[PDB]
């Protein structure tokens, strides 16, 4: 039919336009942002670069299909292939962390790690029961609808005070004891948490926001040997898309485990709509890489690049909280240098160096504004080895040296850009 | 440096792989799903096809940047270009609906319409205050943390009973009166809601889940002349990515309006993490199209394709709830034909026809399982005009005729596939 | 010992003083009030006159023993005889209402009927769950801690609309459906409440504040044939001391009944301290009286006196809500006469007539302030028969005639006093 | 009239019967209890002996008038004289504790100290907000409807650890910080509580259940110098009737004070019905006595009798918690003697000695069941001086010697009786 043929040309002329054709203004901004990422140093601990395959999935046709529900029993029919993808993504999630499907289940639908945590609480608690997690020195949604009693690192050392923690948890008796989160540069002592959770009758939950990739690479201690629930992000050290994961115990107890029905129903229909199918397939791709040998090398390099950068700052008499790092991030007290995190943040940005401020403690226990947080995963994905992270520490210290005027920035920005533009940007050129 | 050059080839060999190279198994499933969409009839009222530009944004590099916060005051530095994009997206959102920035504000960060509704409640209510929305004939997250008292359509007619509604709202006095949602095939009488909300002291909220595109095209009544809050999806009639929007009143009242601080803080940091930057730029692209003249033609055709399909079913003595539709969807009572929605759902799927079941009322007021819901936006984007929606009604009725055996399916599937494969699939060939 | 002997004189010198000796000022005020009760007409439906036995119990030595707990299981020792009194009082309560101890249990410790109702809610419900009771045309403690959705009488008739109530209860699904309370001048239809409670899954509670003596005397329908929980006052028509009672079902269901442990534990130790031993023994005396033939004659006179007062107002063309009464109280609309309840209230008081105002409806549906409530138990305990209640109707009407003029109050007060002093006052001379 | 005359005989025949006439069975039980109090040693710290004036008020005609509301603003009319009594009682309460009416207000309606505490919470706090008080080593109504985080004494010493308490309060940030309650044998340090309350932003409440007479007599530190709210019982050391009191700050702050309207409205109509008029007049009598020189001598003897009983146990090598007492009560650890509190409890009862068991700590930190609590107000009101409290220590110890053998109980009971009957019983002969 000639009418049907001209109908196809109308669809294609709309459906098949590129960004530069369809929205010149958005394309201009998206190109300026590609240059910004290529021409700067990315030291924000929670940033990374996704590969092209992850990007192809993110920008694919699976979003056209609505898939409310969980695989196998879907609200909408026509999900044969979306179901395969999500099951494969579930299987790969269990495999990346060496989990057995008879002891662990996994939900890959949370829109983010925050939603995933909130989903755990909603599934396991009545509104107003007691949770107890780590706070940085009614804001969060968890503390609006639940009673939350955050614990704190020892101001004097930067490390968690586990004895005070056991006292608090025993006194308060939360239903969920949460470890993980914020920006803690050392290893969590999962045995002591398990011991504490056992004594006070709480479920033990690990939020692996910042370190899921290290755990997968067997380069951080394994929470799954000790926790009952583990949630994670998918975009940080894992290098997948935005999103979150909920892992939970299954089967008989050391009466069965309760989590699976409650958590699934809490994700949908309670708190979310349909899943972001494009994100789920992208995560399948990232989770298949998280289990590769190549990815284990990357994570080892992340850990080694963070150490090399820490050491270079230590050799310039910088005060780092806990004195270093076990993982990929480090917290730098700028108060000795007479600087605040806010001021330093803005000077670094003037030099194509992105860091972010964080609240820290002074030795005496007062909250200081002079904290900055940095990390290695992003520039490690761009190819940087240890010599380059030492150079970057030199940029960082020089920026601080400048900000102690509280002109010469042009030199630093020129040097940072000359430096950064030497390294590939994944999925582009 | 030769070392730095080989470092670039390592990054590129990982960063620049395609799906078919990097994950053959996921690529197989994603290709089977492209064929499924191309070779079938998509009649689920909430599905649509995104264009390539939207897809290019969805699969772009903006996700590498973390952008916690709202534009202008960001937690992380380095968001100059992401801020531009989100502001442009905010401006375009106001423009698509003819809103003035001095009377309306907009947040484009909700991960979905559900999150966006939940965000409104969290920002405006204490846990446990009274909301009152429309229900289909403690499940939802809103009813877990808030006291919710759903109202119902008149079982006898399918239409909302506004007099009973005014009585209920006056008796119960909710803090928020919500219209919109589920799968209501007629126009909402915003004047009566405003009248009812005024009498009982509630804020008036419209959830335009299903009809945001019609509203934008000035082809459905305008909620913004009457509501105080309007939330919407972004992937259904709008043809953007997944996501939600919150619009809210600003400035002086007919003491200023309160919504802006509360709703923004509820989206972040309370309930969400950082925004899905790729989704926001994709939405900017879709919102710039939603305001075009071409898009107004598309929506007019959606409305006309839904009517043509309704009429063709009416001429075969099908019972449709309210007897037709004002918009893009229609609800079909299959009980006369001696069928349930579940059974019919599975037979259609055997013929590459996707519909979804919904609960409906019988005339006497008992809940019937024989409801099915269908809609026109998806196949309208593939180019279908009214003659093709009449053909599709013929497929639908024949499928029902078959399912009254409660063999000849091969003929129907063959005919549906021969039919569907005549129409372009946006962004592909 | 001389020492020990003189120590007795000191104790007696303090312990054995009369009120007039020890507190002349309080004695003066208490004599003024005794005169006021004797020289006045007491027409407040809630008031009555306790006998000397009740007063001797209220003013006895049982208060000296602290008795936290329930009988047979008390916190303290020394309760051998207090236990027997509370047991006897429990047994007499069951007997007064014809109840069998292995289908009904009873707790006589509540400090007041309000406490008793709140104790039931605390025991049976989680904080924030739904109750539904009658309201007069946040305030109550029940509505602060639970979600209350009150129902109302039909404004046009004064009677409850059981069809609107069944609708509301099915829509709202309360966990407790309460009847009784306020000042309903007619019989509750317990069979309809039982049917409504059954359809929506609620516990059926009757608060028999006003009519508990009428029920005891078999002059009002028996709530225990239908309810699951029955609370009551003890000082109104029962003529006992201040306090409340909780009756609850026991044993097998037509799994055992839940209430006993939950309700007792809510009374003590959750909401109350030790019981008022003086009040429990007083109640034992009143409950023994309530089961006797003489009390049945008193309640019959109470009904006949209220009926005679009503008919006398009716012949003066007064408008009474529902047009009369089934029990001991009536509601009178003073709007036609051009008076407010509060204006008429204070005029009556000048004439030694105590009544109290109440909110009522007008025939349309607006709240009228011209309601007054009166009832017969107090003056029936003073000996008045039907002729004396017709005299009192004449006083009431003449008082209203005076207040429509807004002096000759003096004449009406003197007539009320000459009238009221004709009648004995229980327990004095 | 002959009719009217015979009607008086009927009323008098019922109204004027004695308990012995009207209820022989209750009279028998009440005489048995009068003997039991007279022939026993009452060492329960909570008990006391009301005088005849208090009993005549408790057994008077004021109960016949219903009096919902606060004085000067009552629901009903006819309250001219009841108002003056409650005013007088309010004034005497302020006077007994040296308070000025334009810095402190008082509500004398609470049915019990427990009711009074709960009324304060309901008035000052939203449901689900945080209180923090002392617990003995969900249960209480406060913890069902609010979030309670109890603090505890230092197990090793019996004293409160004010440094751990300041830490807890800063961590938990309660809205009300409560001191007082349970059975603390030592002085509360109000200055530290005020400092803790200030640092964490809480209202400071003192529940003076046990020591309200000592405070009135100036024999215990004055809580009103530091607290914002003070509740109290009325029947323990005050020797009044059962009931409670709420004192609250008024007027300008060192914006006005919030408590008055919130607290009064919580008492009535939220949580209670009308007040117990007989109890309010009784309290007026007790409060007048409490401000008199004679009462100050009684409380001094109460302190000296408790001190003499303690020293006698101490010389028998008993272990008392904190080693003694500042007030009227002491706690005794029976673990060294090899006894449980409950075993010793029931033995004492066989010898006409009333004590009650309590939970205590061992020196390590485990809960011991071997606690017993005793105190001096009851037998001091019967006339005992220090020598008689030393005799009583000998009874107590000899009782414990018997129970370590787990007969010669008979000898000890007969000695207790011969001893106890030496002493007068207030208000009888």
Cis amide bond preceding C269, omega within 30: yes
Q: Cα distance from C338 to chain D (closest Cα, Å)?
A: 21
Catalytic residues of C: 66, 68, 207, 233, 236, 242
**Token pair listed for C128:** 């924030």
Nearest-angstrom CA–CA distance, B132 and B117: 13
Q: What are phi and psi of D313, to 5 degrees?
A: -65, -40
CA dihedral of residues A250, A252, A258, A260 (deg, nearest 10)? 20
Q: Cα distance from B139 to chain C (closest Cα, Å)?
A: 15
Q: What are phi and psi of D348, to 5 degrees?
A: -45, -45
**Apex CA B122: angle with CA B118 and CA B125, to 5°?**
125
D-contacting residues in C 342-361 (Cβ below 8 Å): 345-346, 348-349, 354-356
Element (H, E) at A228: none
Q: What are phi and psi of B158, to 5 degrees?
A: 85, -25
All residues at 6 or more sequence positions from D318 whose CB lies less than 8 Å from its CB, including other chains:
D332, D333, D337, D397
**Token pair listed for D223:** 């809580």
**From D86, D92, D184, D207, active-site residue:** D207
Facing D26 at nearest CB: one of C16, C281, C422: C281
Q: Are strands B356-357 and B371-375 parallel, antiparallel or unpaired?
A: antiparallel
Of A294, A297, A238, the C-alpha closest to A113 is A238
Nearest-angstrom CA–CA distance, B175 and A383: 55
Cα dist. B104→A369, B90, B279 in Å?
A: 35, 11, 22
Residue B252, Cβ neighbours under 10 Å: how many? 10
Mutate one of B6, B13, B19, B129 to test the A interface: name it (highest A CB count within 10 A). B19
Nearest chain C residue (CA) to B129:
C147
Q: What are phi and psi of A27, to 5 degrees?
A: -65, -35
Breaks (C-N over 2.5 A) in chain B follow: 137, 254, 406
Return the exposure string of C239-250: e unless at least 16 CB atoms fall within 10 Å of the residue's CB, then b. Answer: bbbbbbbbbbbb
Facing A50 at nearest CB: one of B63, B78, B294: B63
The answer to whether the beta carbons of residues B76 and A356 sit under 8 Å apart is yes
All residues at 6 or more sequence positions from B421 whose CB lies less than 8 Å from its CB, including other chains:
B38, B39
Nearest-angstrom CA–CA distance, A269 and C374: 55
Nearest-angstrom CA–CA distance, B323 and B337: 16
Breaks (C-N over 2.5 A) in chain D follow: 137, 254, 406
Length of chain A: 429
| HEC string for chain D | CHHHHHHHHHHHHHHCCCHHHHCHHHHHHHHHHHHHHHCCEECCCCCCCCCHHHHHHHCCHHHHCCCCEECCEECCCCCHHHHHHHHHHHHHHHHHCCCCCCCEEEECCCCCHHHHHHHHHHHHCCCCCEEECECCCCCCHHHHHCEECCECECCCCCCECHHHHHHHHHHHCCCEEEEECCCCCCCCCHHHHHHHHHHHCCEEEEEECCCHHHHHCCCCCCHHHCCCEEEEECCCCCCCCCCEEEEEECCECCCECCHHHHHHHHHHHHHCCCCCHHHHHHHHHHHHHHCCHHHHHHHHHHHHHHHHHHHHHHHCCCEEHHHCCCCCEEEEECCCCCCCHHHHHHHHHHCCEECEEEEEECCCCCEEEEEEEEECHHHHHCCCCHHHHHHHHHHHHHHHHHHCCCCCHHHHHHHHHHHHCCCCCCCCC
Question: Residues A52, A58, A62, A67: is their CA dihedral positive or negative?
Answer: positive
Q: Partners of D74 in the beta sheet?
A: D69
Helices B293-314 and B386-403, packing angle to 10 deg:
40
Cis amide bond preceding D136, omega within 30: no
Nearest-angstrom CA–CA distance, B390 and C214: 73
Q: Which chains touch C (3 or more CB pairs under 8 A)?
A: B, D
Nearest-angstrom CA–CA distance, C425 and D15: 8
Mutate one of B8, B14, B116 to test the A interface: name it (highest A CB count within 10 A). B14
B-contacting residues in A 175-194 (Cβ below 8 Å): none
Element (H, E) at A210: none
Nearest chain A residue (CA) to D171:
A149
Mutate one of A5, A39, A43, A55 to test the B interface: name it (highest B CB count within 10 A). A55
Nearest-angstrom CA–CA distance, B43 and B313: 14
Q: Are strands B329-333 and B371-375 parallel, antiparallel or unpaired?
A: antiparallel
The reply to whether B249 touches chain C by the CB within 8 Å rule is no
> Given 3-state DSSP classes, what are the helix, strand and coil percentages for chain A, each rounded to the nearest 5?
50, 15, 35
Q: Do B168 and C171 touch (CB under 8 A)?
A: yes
The reply to whether A423 touches chain D by the CB within 8 Å rule is no
Helix (H, G, I), strand (E, B) or coil at A236: coil
Nearest-angstrom CA–CA distance, A246 and A262: 12
Catalytic residues of A: 66, 68, 207, 233, 236, 242
Q: Partners of B206 in the beta sheet?
A: B179, B230
Q: Do C81 and D272 touch (CB under 8 A)?
A: no
Facing A128 at nearest CB: one of D128, D168, D172: D128
DSSP at C97: T
The reply to whether C145 touches chain B by the CB within 8 Å rule is no
Cα dist. A125→A129, A259, D416 in Å?
A: 6, 11, 56
**CATH number of the domain that residue D255 is part of:** 3.40.640.10
Q: Partners of D375 in the beta sheet?
A: D329
The reply to whether D147 touches chain A by the CB within 8 Å rule is yes
**Apex CA D184: angle with CA D183 and CA D186, to 5°?**
145
CB < 8 Å to C147, chain B? 128, 147
Of B198, B185, B266, B200, the C-alpha closest to B227 is B198
The boundaries of the domain holding residue D128 are 59-291
Q: Is B307 a catalytic residue?
A: no
The reply to whether C145 touches chain D by the CB within 8 Å rule is yes
Question: Residues D39, D44, D45, D46: is their CA dihedral positive or negative?
Answer: negative
Q: Cα distance from B195 to chain A (closest Cα, Å)?
A: 31
DSSP string, A15-47: HT--HHHH-HHHHHHHHHHHHHHHTSEE--TT-
Q: Which single residue is written with the structure tokens 């390592």?
A: B10
**From B68, B91, B258, B394, active-site residue:** B68
The reply to whether D128 touches chain A by the CB within 8 Å rule is yes
Length of chain D: 429
Helix (H, G, I), strand (E, B) or coil at C228: coil
Nearest chain B residue (CA) to C172:
B149
The answer to whether the beta carbons of residues D307 and D324 sit under 8 Å apart is yes
The answer to whether the beta carbons of residues B360 and B368 sit under 8 Å apart is yes
Return the exposure string of B286-307: e unless at least 16 CB atoms fall within 10 Å of the residue's CB, then b. Answer: bbbbbbeeebbebbebbbebbb
Give the sheet arrangement for strand A147-148, strand by strand: A104-107, A244-249, A229-233, A203-208, A176-180, A130-132, A147-148
Return the exposure string of A303-334: e unless at least 16 CB atoms fall within 10 Å of the residue's CB, then b. Answer: bebbbbbbebbeeeebbbbbebbbbbbbbbbb
Nearest chain D residue (CA) to A172:
D149
- Report CA Rg, chain A: 23
By the 10 Å C-beta count (0-12 exposed, 13-18 middle, 19+ buried), D254 is classed as: exposed
Q: Cα distance from D213 to chain C (closest Cα, Å)?
A: 16
Q: Determine the distance from the C-alpha atom of residue C55 to the mean position of all C-alpha atoms in its chain, rounded to a whole number.
A: 18
Nearest-angstrom CA–CA distance, B95 and B110: 19
The reply to whether D145 touches chain A by the CB within 8 Å rule is no
- Please measure the distance between the N-terminal and C-terminal CA atoms of chain B and give it in whole angstroms: 45
| HEC string for chain B | CHHHHHHHHHHHHHHCCCHHHHCHHHHHHHHHHHHHHHCCEECCCCCCCCCHHHHHHHCCHHHHCCCCEECCEECCCCCHHHHHHHHHHHHHHHHHCCCCCCCEEEECCCCCHHHHHHHHHHHHCCCCCEEECECCCCCCHHHHHCEECCECECCCCCCECHHHHHHHHHHHCCCEEEEECCCCCCCCCHHHHHHHHHHHCCEEEEEECCCHHHHHCCCCCCHHHCCCEEEEECCCCCCCCCCEEEEEECCECCCECCHHHHHHHHHHHHHCCCCCHHHHHHHHHHHHHHCCHHHHHHHHHHHHHHHHHHHHHHCCCCEEHHHCCCCCEEEEECHHHCCCHHHHHHHHHCCCEECEECCEECCCCCEECCEEEEECHHHHHCCCCHHHHHHHHHHHHHHHHHHCCCCCHHHHHHHHHHHHCCCCCCCCC
The answer to whether the beta carbons of residues B149 and B132 sit under 8 Å apart is yes
CB-defined contacts A:D, below 8 A: 10
Q: Do B77 and A345 touch (CB under 8 A)?
A: yes
Give the sheet arrangement for strand C147-148, strand by strand: C104-107, C244-249, C229-233, C203-208, C176-180, C130-132, C147-148
Facing D147 at nearest CB: one of A147, A168, A171: A147
B-contacting residues in A 251-270 (Cβ below 8 Å): 266, 269-270
Element (H, E) at A301: helix A293-314
- Please measure the distance between the N-terminal and C-terminal CA atoms of chain C and give it in whole angstroms: 44
Nearest-angstrom CA–CA distance, B221 and D203: 53
The reply to whether D235 touches chain A by the CB within 8 Å rule is no
> Given 3-state DSSP classes, what are the helix, strand and coil percentages for chain C, each rounded to the nearest 5?
50, 15, 35
- Report CA Rg, chain B: 23
Q: Determine the distance from the C-alpha atom of residue B345 to the mean position of all C-alpha atoms in its chain, rounded to a whole number.
A: 21
- Report CA Rg, chain C: 23
CB < 8 Å to B12, chain A? 424, 426, 429
Q: Determine the distance from the C-alpha atom of residue D123 to the mean position of all C-alpha atoms in its chain, rounded to a whole number.
A: 22
Q: Do D149 and A172 touch (CB under 8 A)?
A: yes
Element (H, E) at A294: helix A293-314
Q: Within 13 Å, how many C-alpha atoms sit on residue D375's CB side?
A: 25
Alpha helices in C59-149 (DSSP H): 80-96, 113-124, 141-145
Mutate one of B139, B144, B147, B161 to test the C interface: name it (highest C CB count within 10 A). B147
Q: Do A349 and B78 touch (CB under 8 A)?
A: yes
Q: Cα distance from C172 to chain B (closest Cα, Å)?
A: 7
Element (H, E) at C388: helix C386-403
Mutate one of B9, B32, B59 to test the A interface: name it (highest A CB count within 10 A). B59
Residue D202, Cβ neighbours under 10 Å: how many? 22
By the 10 Å C-beta count (0-12 exposed, 13-18 middle, 19+ buried), D257 is classed as: middle
The reply to whether B52 touches chain A by the CB within 8 Å rule is yes
Q: Method of determination? A: X-ray
**Token pair listed for D301:** 């003897």
Cα dist. B200→A141, B193, B195, B428 in Å?
A: 29, 11, 9, 52
The answer to whether the beta carbons of residues C190 and C225 sit under 8 Å apart is yes
Q: Are strands B104-107 and B130-132 parallel, antiparallel or unpaired?
A: unpaired
Q: What are phi and psi of C320, to 5 degrees?
A: -105, 140
The answer to whether the beta carbons of residues D245 and D110 sit under 8 Å apart is yes
DSSP at A64: G
Helix (H, G, I), strand (E, B) or coil at A422: coil
Nearest-angstrom CA–CA distance, B46 and B213: 12
Nearest-angstrom CA–CA distance, C38 and C92: 31
Nearest-angstrom CA–CA distance, A76 and A66: 7
Region of residue D184 (left: phi > 0; alpha: psi -120 to 50; beta: else): beta
Helices then strands, each counted (H, E), chain A? 17, 17
Nearest chain B residue (CA) to A281:
B26
Q: Is B207 a catalytic residue?
A: yes
Q: Determine the distance from the C-alpha atom of residue D274 to the mean position of all C-alpha atoms in its chain, rounded to a whole number.
A: 22
All residues at 6 or more sequence positions from B292 whose CB lies less than 8 Å from its CB, including other chains:
none
Q: Is D36 a catalytic residue?
A: no
Alpha helices in A19-161 (DSSP H): 19-22, 24-38, 52-58, 80-96, 113-124, 141-145
Helix (H, G, I), strand (E, B) or coil at C134: strand
Return the exposure string of D354-364: e unless at least 16 CB atoms fall within 10 Å of the residue's CB, then b. Answer: bbbbbbbbeee
Nearest-angstrom CA–CA distance, C36 and B68: 74
Facing D8 at nearest CB: one of C36, C64, C383: C383
Of D416, D362, D337, D292, the C-alpha closest to D137 is D362
Facing B383 at nearest CB: one of A10, A32, A285: A10
Q: Do A147 and D128 touch (CB under 8 A)?
A: yes
Of D355, D205, D206, D220, the C-alpha closest to D290 is D220
Nearest-angstrom CA–CA distance, C84 and C74: 12
CB-defined contacts B:C, below 8 A: 10
């Amino acid at each position: 039919s000639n009418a049907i043929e001209s109908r196809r040309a109308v669809v294609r002329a709309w459906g098949n336009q590129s960004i530069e054709e369809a929205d010149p203004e958005i394309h201009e901004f998206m190109e300026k942002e590609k240059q910004r990422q290529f021409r700067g140093i990315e030291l924000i601990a929670s940033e990374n670069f996704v590969c092209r395959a992850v990007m192809e999935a993110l920008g694919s046709h699976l979003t056209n299909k609505y898939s409310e529900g969980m695989p196998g029993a879907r609200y909408y029919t026509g999900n044969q292939y979306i179901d395969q993808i999500e099951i494969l993504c579930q299987e790969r999630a269990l495999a990346a962390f060496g989990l057995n499907h008879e002891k662990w289940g996994v939900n890959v639908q949370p829109y983010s790690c925050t939603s995933a945590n909130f989903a755990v609480f909603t599934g396991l608690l009545m509104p107003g029961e007691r949770i107890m997690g780590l706070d940085s020195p009614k804001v969060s949604g968890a503390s609006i609808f639940f009673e939350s009693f955050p614990y704190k690192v020892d101001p004097r050392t930067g490390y968690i005070d586990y004895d005070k923690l056991e006292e608090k948890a025993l006194d308060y008796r939360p239903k969920i004891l949460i470890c993980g989160g914020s920006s803690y540069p050392r290893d969590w002592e999962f045995p002591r948490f398990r011991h504490i959770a056992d004594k006070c009758g709480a479920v033990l939950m690990f939020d692996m926001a910042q370190i899921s990739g290290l755990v997968a690479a067997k380069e951080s201690p394994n929470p799954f040997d000790y926790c009952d629930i583990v949630t994670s992000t998918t975009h940080k050290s894992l290098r997948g898309p935005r999103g979150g994961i909920i892992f939970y115990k299954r089967g008989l107890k050391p009466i069965q485990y309760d989590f699976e029905e409650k958590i699934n129903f809490s994700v949908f229909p309670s708190l979310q709509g349909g899943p972001h199918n494009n994100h789920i397939a992208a995560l399948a791709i990232a989770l298949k890489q998280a289990a590769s040998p190549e990815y284990k090398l990357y994570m080892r390099q992340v850990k080694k690049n963070a150490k090399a950068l820490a050491s270079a700052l230590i050799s310039r008499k910088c005060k780092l909280i806990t004195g270093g790092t076990d993982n990929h991030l480090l917290l730098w007290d700028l108060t000795p240098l007479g600087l605040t995190g806010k001021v330093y943040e803005k000077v670094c940005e003037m030099c194509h160096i992105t860091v972010n401020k964080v609240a820290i403690f002074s030795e005496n226990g007062v909250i200081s504004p002079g904290g900055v947080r940095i990390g290695s995963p992003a520039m490690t994905s761009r190819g940087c080895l240890e010599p380059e992270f030492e150079t970057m520490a030199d940029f960082l210290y020089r920026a601080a040296q400048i900000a102690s005027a509280a002109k010469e920035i042009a030199d630093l920005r020129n040097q940072v850009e000359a430096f950064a533009t030497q390294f590939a940007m994944p999925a582009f050129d």
